Amino acid sequence: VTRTAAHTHIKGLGLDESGVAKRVEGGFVGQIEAREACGVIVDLIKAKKMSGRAILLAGGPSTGKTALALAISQELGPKVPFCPLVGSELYSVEVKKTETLMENFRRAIGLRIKETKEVYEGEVTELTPEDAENPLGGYGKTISHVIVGLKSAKGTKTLRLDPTIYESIQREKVSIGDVIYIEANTGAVKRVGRSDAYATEFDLETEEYVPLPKGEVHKKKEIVQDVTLHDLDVANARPQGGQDVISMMGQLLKPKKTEITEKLRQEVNKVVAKYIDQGVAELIPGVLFIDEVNMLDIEIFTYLNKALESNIAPVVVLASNRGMTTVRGTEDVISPHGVPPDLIDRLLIVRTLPYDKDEIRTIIERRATVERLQVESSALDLLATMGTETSLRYALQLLAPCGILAQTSNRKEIVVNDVNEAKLLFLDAKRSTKILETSANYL
Amino acid sequence: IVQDVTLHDLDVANARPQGGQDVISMMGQLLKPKKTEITEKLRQEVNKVVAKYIDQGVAELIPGVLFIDEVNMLDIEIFTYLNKALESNIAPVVVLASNRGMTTVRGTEDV
Amino acid sequence: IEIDVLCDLTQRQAKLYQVLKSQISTNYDAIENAATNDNLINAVMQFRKVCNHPDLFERADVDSPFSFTTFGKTTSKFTDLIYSSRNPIKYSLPRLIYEDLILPNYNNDVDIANKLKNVKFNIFNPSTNYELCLFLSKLTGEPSLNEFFRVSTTPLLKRVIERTNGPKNTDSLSFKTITQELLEVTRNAPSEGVMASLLNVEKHAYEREYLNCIQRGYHPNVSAPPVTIEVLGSSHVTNSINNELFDPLISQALSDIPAITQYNMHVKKGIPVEDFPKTGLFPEPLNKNFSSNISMPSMDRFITESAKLRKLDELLVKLKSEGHRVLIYFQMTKMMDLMEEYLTYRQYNHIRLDLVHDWQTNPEIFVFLLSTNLTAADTVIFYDSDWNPTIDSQAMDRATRQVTVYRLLVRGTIEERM
Amino acid sequence: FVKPRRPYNSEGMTRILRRYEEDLFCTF
Amino acid sequence: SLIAAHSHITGLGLDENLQPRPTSEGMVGQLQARRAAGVILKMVQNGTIAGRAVLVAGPPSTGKTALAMGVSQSLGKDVPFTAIAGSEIFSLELSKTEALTQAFRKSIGIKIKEETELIEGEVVEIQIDRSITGGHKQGKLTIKTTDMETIYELGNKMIDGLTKEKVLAGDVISIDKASGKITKLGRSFARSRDYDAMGADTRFVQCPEGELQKRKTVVHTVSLHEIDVINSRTQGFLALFTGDTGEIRSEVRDQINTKVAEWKEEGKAEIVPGVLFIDEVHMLDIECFSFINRALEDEFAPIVMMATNRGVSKTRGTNYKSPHGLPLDLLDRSIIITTKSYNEQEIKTILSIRAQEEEVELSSDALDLLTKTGVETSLRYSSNLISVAQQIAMKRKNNTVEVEDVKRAYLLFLDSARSVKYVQENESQYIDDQGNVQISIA
Amino acid sequence: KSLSLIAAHSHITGLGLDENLQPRPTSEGMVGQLQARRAAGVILKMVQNGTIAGRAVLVAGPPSTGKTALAMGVSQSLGKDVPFTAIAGSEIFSLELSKTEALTQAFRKSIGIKIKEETELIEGEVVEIQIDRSITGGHKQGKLTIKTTDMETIYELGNKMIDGLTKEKVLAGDVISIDKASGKITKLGRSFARSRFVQCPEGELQKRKTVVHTVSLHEIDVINSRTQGFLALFTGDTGEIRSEVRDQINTKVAEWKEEGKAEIVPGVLFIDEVHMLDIECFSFINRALEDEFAPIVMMATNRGVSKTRGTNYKSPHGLPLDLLDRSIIITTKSYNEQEIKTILSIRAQEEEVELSSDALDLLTKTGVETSLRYSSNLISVAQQIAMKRKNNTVEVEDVKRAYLLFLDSARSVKYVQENESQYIDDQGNVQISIAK
Ligand SMILES: Nc1ncnc2c1ncn2[C@@H]1O[C@H](COP(=O)(O)OP(=O)(O)O)[C@@H](O)[C@H]1O
Ligand SMILES: Nc1ncnc2c1ncn2[C@@H]1O[C@H](COP(=O)(O)OP(=O)(O)O)[C@@H](O)[C@H]1O
Ligand SMILES: Nc1ncnc2c1ncn2[C@@H]1O[C@H](COP(=O)(O)OP(=O)(O)O)[C@@H](O)[C@H]1O
C-alpha cells in the first residue's frame, strides 16, 4: 500500500507534559535520557530566544541518532525549517566550503510575511497600440502606448500602458479573448487561458478554458508567504524579476554559486528588521542537522567556531560515531569523536546507549508491523537472537526476503524455515569476512 | 551521394542545438567552445535511430580501430572504465601497446 | 442500511494537522479526553476545520514568488499603468567619486587616455598596421579591412545582436567544417529523410515523451530587481542608469513589434524591411506553463485537496446513474457556501437560500443541503458526522423506499476515535 | 443556443491560401 | 546486430517457486546467487520498500556482471536500470555527492497518464497569416473526413509543423493534440496542375471515414532527474543531452518531491522505482560511502546493487584496510550475495553457449581442449579464442573449427601466465621500474 | 534595527575604562583582565588618533580567556562610521580568488574615506493635485499644493514632474519627499488624517541637508575598475582586480586629501584564528603593513609551539619569527572563582534567567571544575527544566538535572575510553553485535 524506508515508524519523541519519556511511545524503545534531553532542546528551540546553540549526539553505530534528529524535526512541526545535511555535502566544485556552510546557516532561518499585491485581471477585449512619430530615431522605441481594455464580472476598465509592461504582455503571447493576470509589484504577467464566453471546440493548442474573474479589475489582496534568508540573498545576488534587460538576461544564463558578500547580508538583515518593526513579518529560527560530522576538515571546524558567534545563527545538531580519532586535515590532533577541542567547549554532548535483547525484539516487532507483515513467536525469537549475534540492522532488513519466501509458498506466515533460508541465501559482514580470510584469490 | 561520418560527429551535431534566433545559441557560437559531458541518453537515441536506418537498408556501420600507444601511463580509473566500456554493443576493436615488464600501475602503490 | 466510508488524509491536510499538533504543546491526550466528553473547544474547532476542508482554515490563493520590491502602490477615461518597481536596498554614492573618476572634465584625462588606449595604439588600426589587416583578411576572408577594428572595439552583446550573414570570398584559408555542412542541410529539410532524421534526435525525444503538455513543478520563492544606485543631486546618473537598464536596442531585440505597426512602417512610411530594428531573439519556453512563475487556483485541485469531497465526487456518480435524491447534513454555514460554489461549478440542481413544498412539487432537484421534513428521500449522507444520537435520530425520521445512510470518516484523526 | 466563435484579427498581415485547385500568396 | 560479452543472457532462468533450473535462459550453474537475485527481483517488482543495499562479492570471472545483466533483463520494460561504474563519479564540474544524487534520481521512474485527441482527415484549405517580418503567425485549417468537416484554428507551433513537412490540399494528415505532432499519411486528390518544383511520389491512401476527432489515453514514463533538469532553468531540455546541469539546488528537489506526491495523490502519476547498479564500487572515496549511508534512508531511493571482486584491501581516502574495500558502516546496512568458482562441466556449457551465440561449429575434441585450456587458464581467454579459431578456420575454406586451428590460435596469442613467464626471463629487454633497459643486442 | 536573538558576546558594550585609561573591575560587561584591557585601550587610542598606520598586534593566551571578548570590546568602543572587518583564518582559501588577492581586499576594506556633501530637498504633505489635459492631450498642465506645519505653497508643474507624479501614484494627504535635481520622489507615508502613518513635517519646505558619506577603498577600487560594475560588491565576484587601478585610486585619494575634499578614516582589521594561514599569507602580510594606506591589524591565536602551515617545522604561536618581529603581543590569563561567578551572573542577566544563590555557587564550582563555556551553556538549558515544573527561579535541582542530561569534555572522554569496542577507531574497527 504505502512505501517505507528505514524510518517512518517514528512519529516524535513521545514524552509527557512534564518531559518524562514513556517506554514505548512514538515508535521509540528505550533511550529515555536522550529523548528527555532532546525534549529540553525542543523546548529551547520553541522558546525562540537563543542563537548559536550547538549539541552533539555521540554514540555507537545503530544506536538511534538519526532517528532522534528525525523526532526533533517531527516534534517541531513543518513551520520551523529543518535542514538535513551530511558532512560530504560541503565540498563543492563551484564555490568554497566556507560559503556552502554559511549558505546552509542562512537556509536554516525562516520567515513569514503577509504581502499585499496590486492586481489587474480580466478578459482582454481591445488591444490597440499607438505609434511613434519617428521610430528609427535611434533612441526611443517603436510604439508609444498600448491601450488595453479589460472586463470582469460587474466591471470593465481601460488601461493605458507604457511600452515596458507591454513587452512582458507580448512575451506572454496574449491576444483578444484571453484571460490575463497583471500584478503591479514586479510587472509580471500571467496568461490564464481562453475565456469560456466563446466556442471551446475549435482549437488545436490543448488549452483550457476559464470563466471571467469575479470582483472588480483592480484589487489588493493579502498573501502569506514563507521564505528563508538564503532565498532573499540568492534573489538579490542573481537578480531576476524586474523588467530591465539585466533581469531578463539573468534568467537566460546558467546559474552558478557565488561568494555572497557580507554587505548584502547586512542589508538584507536591515530590510528584514524594518519589515518586522512594521508588524508585517515574524521570525522563525530553525535547526541545521549535520550528519557524519567527522567528515569535515579542520578549516570548516575553525569557521564553525566563528559562525556560531553570530547573532542570527540557528541551533546546530551534530552526530558522530568515533572514539579517539585524528581530525581530517591534521596529522597529530587526536580528539574525542573526531571533533577538535575548540568546538567541544561550545557544545553540549548527548550520549546514546546500546540496546538489550528485549529492546531488539520489540524494535523488530514494530518494524514488522509497519511493513505489513506478521511473524510467529519462534521466528521472532530467532530474529532477536540473530540481531544480538550479528547486528540490529541485519535482523531488520532480513524481514523482506523472509516475507517474499513466505509469499512464494502461498502462506501469510513467516516461520523458522523462511528465516533459515534467508540465512542460507544472504550473509552478513562477519561471515563474508570469514570467507574472505580463508580464500584462494580474494573470494 | 554516398557520405561518410563517424558516430562522434552525430553526437556533437545532435548535442549542439539547431540554429535558431535565441541569444544563447549565437552567444555560444561567438564564444569559446568548451567541451561538455555528453550524457548516455543522447548516445542511446543516436544508436536507436542509426539501427533503425540500418534496418531499412540505407546506412551501413563501419567499425574501426582505436590504437592507444604506451598504455602504461593510464590511471587505474581509466582501466576500470575500459573494463566497463568494452562490454558495449557498439564498441570497436581497441589495440594497446606497452614496453614495460613488472611495473606498478599508476595510482596504486602496490599492484 | 448504515455503512461508513473511510478516507485517507491528503498532504496539505496532514501538514495542517501536524502544524496544529505542534502548536498546542502536544496535549493531545486532553484533546482526546474532552473529545470523548462531548477553552479547549476553540482548540478542537481548528482540528475539525482542518479535517472538514483545508480552505476553511486557510484559503488557497494565487501562488506567486515574494516580490522584493518598493513600487508605487495605491493607498485606497483611462488609468495609466507605468512600470515603477525598485529594490529596497539602496547603495549611496557621493558625487565627488562620479564627477572626478567617471565623468570627463578639465582636470582629468578620461577621454584622452581612452582615445590613447583604444584608437591610436590599437593594433587593428589600418592607418598604422595595414600589413596585419591584410594578413587577417587573407586568413579569414572578410571583404572589409575595417572589420577587425570594428569587432575589437564593440561589446559582445552589441556584436551578437547586429550580426549579419554577409558573404565572404572563396579565396581564403577558412573553409567549412564537416559538422557545419551536416547542419546546413537540415535547416528546412522535411521528415522521412535519412540525413534529416539522423540530425533531429532532440525534437523526436520532445514529441515522444509529450513534453508540450507537462506541468511546471518549481517556481522561485523570492524575485528581486537589481540593486538601486542612488546619487543625490545629479541628473546624469539617472540618465545613465535609465539608459543602461532600458537600452532600446537590447530591449527591442528581446521582443517583437506589433504587426499593424510593421504595416505602418513598411507601406505607410516606405521604410524597408532591412532597416527594421531586429526582433524576436528571446528564447521560447518549453511549454505555455513554463512562461511565468504565477500559478492559478484550479478547480481540480479543490476536489482532490479535501478527501471527503473527493469521496463524495466518487460516490455521487452512482447515485446520479441510479436516479436518486440526495441530502447532506452540515453544522456550519461556511461549508454551506463551499458546497454552493462547488455545486455551481458542478452545475447540479440544488436549493438557493417553502422548502418542503418545493421539495414535494419539484422532482427535478438532486441534492439538498440543510444545517442542524422529506419522504421521497432515498439516500442521505452525513458529512460532518457527530454521534450524538439526539440529532441523528431527528435527522433520520425527518426524512417509502429503502433508505441508505452514509457517513464519511477520515483515517488517523479525531473522527476515527469518535 | 450556439456559442459564437472567437474574433479573427488579421490586418496588416500577409496571407498564404492553399486551396484544392490553386495556391495564392498575398504580399505587401 | 553485434555480439557483446553478455549477449547470451536474457533473463534469470527461474521457475514459479524461485528455484533455478540447471541450464536455462542463457545461465548455467550458480544456483544460490540466482535464487537470491530472484528474491531481489521480486523485491523490486513489489515496489513497497526503498533504499536497500545489496552487495555481490566473489572472485573474478564468476558471473557477477552476468547476474546483474540477468536481473536487468528479467526486470522488463519501462523500469529504470542505471548501470554505472565507480570511476564516473569524479567529475570536474560536479561534486561527488551531486553526481551520486543524480545517479540515485535517475533510477526512479514516474508513469504519467495523459489524455490526447487524434484528428485525421483530408485537408481542404490552409490559410496562413504572417507578419511582414514573420514572427506573429496565425491561421485557419479546414480538415475533412467522409462524414464530417470542421474548421480549426492554428497557432505558431502548428503552423511550424505544417510548413516543414509540406502539406497541400488533398493530403491526409494525422494530428495529435497533446504531443503537437503532424504526420502525413499520403495523398488522395492527385492534383493535375502540379508545378514541377519537387520530385514527390506521395502514396495513394483512402478517404478516412467516421469520427473526425477521437480521444485516447496515453502513458509515458519519465525519470525524476529529468524533471529536476527540466525545472532547473530556462533551457534545461538542452542540458538533458549536453550534460550541462551544474549542481542543481536543494529547493528544486524539495518542490519536485512535493509535486510528485501531489500528482500521486490525485491519480495522474505513479512512482515506479528501479535498480541502480554500481560496478567496481571499491573505486570510491570514503565521502561517497558516507553520503550513500544516509541517501539510502530516503523515501525516493532505489534498490542499489553493488559488485566487488576485492578482498581485505585499502579503502580509498583512508590509510587502513577493510573487507571488500568498504567501511563497516556501509557493510552494516547491506546484505551480501556470494559467488563461487566454476566446475569443468559448467565451463564446457559456458563455452558451448558462447559458441552457439557467435555461430561457430566446434568439434567435440576442440570443445574438450577448449575446456582444458579454460580450466587451466581463465574462462575469458578460452571464450576469446573461439572467434580467432574460426577466422583461422575460414583461411583453409572449411566451416568447422578443428583442433589444429585452436592449437594455432593458442600458439599465436598468449595468456597472462605465459606472458609473465616470457617477461621474467628477459628483464633486460623490457623497461624496469627503475627505468633501466638494454636496447642494443650486443 | 539590527535584529538579533541573543549573542554569546552580547553583554560587552565596550572596554570599561576611566579617563586616564584605567580599567574598572566591572564596567560595560567586562570583568577582570586589567592589563589586557589597558593594552587594548592603548590600541584604541592608537586607532582614534589616526596618525600612524600598519601596526600589527597579537592577542595570545589559553582558550576561553576572553580574546574574542577583547576584540568585541574594541569594536563596540570604536562605534559607527569607522571600518571594522572581522575575518577568520579559513575564509581566504577561495576557489576564484588568490590568497594574496583576498588578503588585499580584506586590507582595503578596513580603510575608508569621509566625504561631506549637501543636497536640497522638498518635504511636505500633499494637499491637492490637479492634472489638466488639452483637447488632444499633447501638453499637460498641473498644480500641486503642499504644506508643512508652518507654511503652505502652490507649485506649477511641468511635463516631467507630472509624469513622475502619475507614476508612483500620489494622492492627497500623502507625505512625500522630492529631489529636484534627480527627479526621485519617495512616499514617506500617510499623514495623521482619519477624516503607514507618519507625522506632518515641520519648518521650511525647501531644506538644504548635509549628508556625510563614508566609503571604503575597496568600493572605489571595484567601481574604478571597468571589468565589473558596483553589483560585484553584492554578488561577490570581483575576480582579481588589477594593481594599476589601485595606484590610480591611491593617487586620487592623496590629491583629494590635499585639496581638502575628503578625509581618511583608518580602521581595524581583525583576523581570528591567524594560525590557519599559509606561509605565503604571512609573507604577504609582512610586506603589506608598510603601505601608507594600511589599517591596524589585530590577530588572535591560542596555540603553543605548533607546526606552521605549509612548512615542516614548528614555531611559537604557529607564526614565523619574521612576522613576530613586527608585532607587539598582549597576553591574556586564566580566571579566578570570583571572575567566573561574575561572568555567570552577567550571562544570567542577559539571558533573563533568575538564579538562586546556591545555583550560582554550584555553577561556579562546576565552571572552575570543567569550563566557563560549559556553565554558560548549562545556565540557559536549566531554565527550560525549571519551566517544565512551572516555577520561575532556577534552583539546584534543575542545575543537577541539566548536569546529568548534558555531558562535558572530560566525562565524554571517560565514557568513551572504556567503551572503545563500540566506537569506530582510527583503524576503522568496531563491534556492533551485543554478544561475542
Ligand atoms: N529507539 C529506537 N526505536 C525504534 N527503532 C530504532 C531505535 N533506535 C534505532 N532504531 C532503528 O535502528 C536504525 C538505526 O539507524 P540510525 O539511527 O540511522 O543509525 P545510528 O544509530 O548510527 O545513528 C534505524 O533504522 C532506526 O529505525
Ligand atoms: N552463470 C553464467 N551464465 C552465463 N554466462 C556466465 C555465467 N557465469 C559467467 N559467465 C560469463 O563469464 C563472464 C564473467 O565475467 P563478469 O561477470 O563480467 O565478471 P565477474 O564474473 O568477475 O563478476 C561473463 O562474460 C559471462 O558471460
Ligand atoms: N573578561 C571577561 N568579561 C566578560 N566576559 C568574558 C570575559 N572573558 C571571557 N568572557 C566570556 O566568556 C565566553 C568565552 O570566551 P571567549 O572570548 O570566547 O574565549 P576565547 O578568548 O578563547 O575566544 C565569551 O562569551 C565571553 O563573553
* Residue among F96, F423, F433 whose CB faces A323 most closely: F423
Known binding residue E63? Answer is yes
Q: Whose CA is nearest to atom 4 of ligand 2?
A: E27
Distance between CA E333 and CA F344 in Å, rounded? 46
Coil/strand/helix, residue E103? helix
Measured in angstroms, how far is the CA atom of residue F65 from the centroid of ligand 3?
6
Contact between residue A354 and residue F434 where contact means Cβ atoms under 8 Å apart: yes
Using the atom order of ligand 1, give the atom closest to the CA of residue A31.
1
Provide the Cα torsion F369, F370, F373, F376; round to 10°.
-50
3-state helix, strand, coil in chain F (%, to 5): 35, 25, 40
Distance between CA B104 and CA E110 in Å, rounded? 47
Question: Is it the case that chain B and chain F have 3 or more CB pairs lying under 8 Å apart?
Answer: no
Q: A3 — contact with chain E (CB < 8 Å)? A: yes
Question: Is it the case that chain C and chain D have 3 or more CB pairs lying under 8 Å apart?
Answer: yes
Give me F307's grid cell.
607546526
Distance between CA E80 and CA E223 in Å, rounded? 8
Which of F35, F38, F68 maximizes ligand 3 atoms within 8 Å of its Cβ, making it the mutation to test the pocket? F68
Residue C207 burial class via C-beta count within 10 angstroms: exposed 0-12, middle 13-18, buried 19 and up: middle
Q: What is the identity of the amino acid at E90? A: F
The response to whether residue F343 sits with its C-beta less than 6 Å from ligand 3 reads yes
Tell me the ligand closest to F73's alpha carbon: 3
Closest-CA residue of D relative to C262 is: D12
Q: What angle do CA F240, F245, F251 make, to 5 degrees?
A: 140
From chain C, the residues in CB contact with E238 under 8 A are 202
* Residue among F115, F168, F223 whose CB faces C72 most closely: F168
Instruction: List the resolution, Å.
Output: 2.8
Q: C233 — contact with chain E (CB < 8 Å)? A: no
Measured in angstroms, how far is the CA atom of residue F405 from the centroid of ligand 1?
20
Known binding residue A65? Answer is yes
Closest-CA residue of D relative to E131 is: D13
State whether C294 and A190 contact (CB < 8 Å): yes
How far CA F384 is from CA of A36, A47, E291, F10, in Å, comes to 12, 9, 35, 21
Q: b vs e for B51-62, b when ≥16 Cβ sit within 10 Å of the residue's Cβ?
A: eebeeeeebeee
CB within 8 Å of A57: residues ≥ 6 apart: A34, A65, A68, A69, A317, A318, A319, A320, A350, A352
* Residue among E178, E234, E252 whose CB faces C213 most closely: E178
Give me A323's grid cell.
572514539
Q: A306 — contact with chain F (CB < 8 Å)? A: yes
Would you say how long chain F is, in residues? 436
How far CA C110 is from CA of C105, C117, C150, C166, in Å, comes to 8, 11, 21, 36
State whether F428 and E315 contact (CB < 8 Å): yes
Q: Whose CA is nearest to atom 24 of ligand 1?
A: A6
Using the atom order of ligand 1, give the atom closest to the CA of residue A62.
21
Q: Is the dihedral of CA C142, C148, C149, C152 positive or negative?
A: positive
Coil/strand/helix, residue F234? helix
Quick one: which of B48, E163, E166 has its CA closest to C208?
B48
**Residue C276 — left, alpha, or beta (φ > 0 → left; ψ -120 to 50 → alpha)?**
beta
Distance between CA F291 and CA C291 in Å, rounded? 54
**Residue A199 — left, alpha, or beta (φ > 0 → left; ψ -120 to 50 → alpha)?**
beta
If you write DSSP's letter for every residue of A361-398 in order, what string do you get?
Answer: HHHHHHHHHHTT--B-HHHHHHHHHHHHHT-HHHHHTT
Coil/strand/helix, residue F402? helix
Contact between residue E392 and residue E405 where contact means Cβ atoms under 8 Å apart: yes
> Among C97, C100, C102, C238, which would you mutate to test the F interface (most chain F Cβ atoms within 10 Å of its Cβ)?
C97
Coil/strand/helix, residue A191? strand
Give me C317's grid cell.
456518480
How far CA F417 is from CA of A34, B70, F34, in Å, comes to 20, 53, 40
Q: What is the DSSP letter of F418?
A: T
Coil/strand/helix, residue C92? strand
Q: F211 — contact with chain E (CB < 8 Å)? A: no
The response to whether residue F67 sits with its C-beta less than 6 Å from ligand 3 reads yes
Alpha helices in A62-199 (DSSP H): 66-76, 97-107, 163-171
* Residue among F90, F196, F436 whose CB faces A303 most closely: F90
Distance between CA E30 and CA E346 in Å, rounded? 9
Distance between CA E177 and CA B45 in Å, rounded? 24
Distance between CA A174 and CA C13 in Å, rounded? 36
Min distance E122 CA to chain C CA atoms (Å): 19
Q: Is the dihedral of CA B11, B15, B21, B27 positive or negative?
A: negative
Which of A13, A38, A62 maximizes ligand 1 atoms within 8 Å of its Cβ, making it the mutation to test the pocket? A62
Min distance C262 CA to chain D CA atoms (Å): 8
Q: D21 — contact with chain E (CB < 8 Å)? A: yes
Contact between residue F430 and residue F422 where contact means Cβ atoms under 8 Å apart: yes
Question: Mind spelling out the 3-state secondary structure of C161-202?
Answer: HCCCCCCCCCCCCCCCCHHHHHHCHHHCCCCCCHHHHHCCHH
Can you count the helices (H) and strands (E) in chain B?
4, 2
Known binding residue A401? Answer is no
State whether E2 and B90 contact (CB < 8 Å): yes
Residue B74 burial class via C-beta count within 10 angstroms: exposed 0-12, middle 13-18, buried 19 and up: middle
Using the atom order of ligand 1, give the atom closest to the CA of residue A65.
23
Distance between CA B58 and CA B72 in Å, rounded? 41
Give me F56's grid cell.
600589527
Residues paired with residue F270 on neighbouring β-strands, in sequence order: F86, F298
Distance between CA F297 and CA F299 in Å, rounded? 7
Q: What are phi and psi of C97, to 5 degrees?
A: -65, -45
Distance between CA A379 and CA A384 in Å, rounded? 9
Q: What angle do CA E138, C288, E243 make, to 5 degrees?
A: 120
Contact between residue E349 and residue E355 where contact means Cβ atoms under 8 Å apart: no
Q: What angle do CA A100, A101, A106 make, to 5 degrees?
A: 95
Contact between residue E61 and residue E380 where contact means Cβ atoms under 8 Å apart: yes
Min distance F224 CA to chain C CA atoms (Å): 7
State whether C68 and A135 contact (CB < 8 Å): no
Q: Is the dihedral of CA A70, A74, A77, A78 positive or negative?
A: positive
Min distance B74 CA to chain A CA atoms (Å): 24
Can you count the helices (H) and strands (E) in chain A?
15, 17
Q: What is the DSSP letter of C116?
A: I
> Among E293, E315, E320, which would you mutate to test the F interface (most chain F Cβ atoms within 10 Å of its Cβ)?
E320
Contact between residue E48 and residue E110 where contact means Cβ atoms under 8 Å apart: no
Q: Whose CA is nearest to atom 11 of ligand 1?
A: A64
Measured in angstroms, how far is the CA atom of residue E350 from the centroid of ligand 2?
9
Min distance B23 CA to chain C CA atoms (Å): 6
State whether F236 and A33 contact (CB < 8 Å): no
Return the residue matching grid coordinates 540568492: A234
**End-to-end CA gap in chain E:** 52
State whether C281 and B21 contact (CB < 8 Å): yes
Return the residue matching grid coordinates 488522395: E188
What angle in degrees, to the nearest 10, is found between the helix axes of A66-76 and A32-47? 40
Q: What is the DSSP letter of E324?
A: G
Alpha helices in C209-297 (DSSP H): 235-245, 248-253, 259-266
Residues paired with residue E108 on neighbouring β-strands, in sequence order: E273
Closest-CA residue of D relative to E152 is: D5
Using the atom order of ligand 1, give the atom closest to the CA of residue A63.
21
Min distance B53 CA to chain A CA atoms (Å): 32
Using the atom order of ligand 2, give the atom closest to the CA of residue E27.
3
Provide the Cα torsion A217, A220, A223, A228; round to 10°.
110
The response to whether residue A391 sits with its C-beta less than 6 Å from ligand 1 reads no
Distance between CA C327 and CA C382 in Å, rounded? 9
Residue B44: in which H helix or E strand, if any?
Answer: helix B40-55
Return the residue matching grid coordinates 561589446: C155
Return the residue matching grid coordinates 539501427: B51
Measured in angstroms, how far is the CA atom of residue A65 from the centroid of ligand 1?
7
Using the atom order of ligand 2, give the atom closest to the CA of residue E6.
27
Distance between CA C316 and CA C314 in Å, rounded? 6
Tell me the ligand closest to A354's alpha carbon: 1
List the chains bordering chain F where 3 or more Cβ pairs fall under 8 Å: A, C, E
How far CA E343 is from CA of A267, A310, E362, E371, F327, in Å, comes to 74, 68, 20, 10, 78
Distance between CA F248 and CA F254 in Å, rounded? 10
Q: b vs e for E104-132, b when ≥16 Cβ sit within 10 Å of the residue's Cβ?
A: bbbbbbbebebebeebbbbbbebbbbbbb
> Among E125, E127, E141, E172, which would you mutate to test the D interface (most chain D Cβ atoms within 10 Å of its Cβ)?
E127
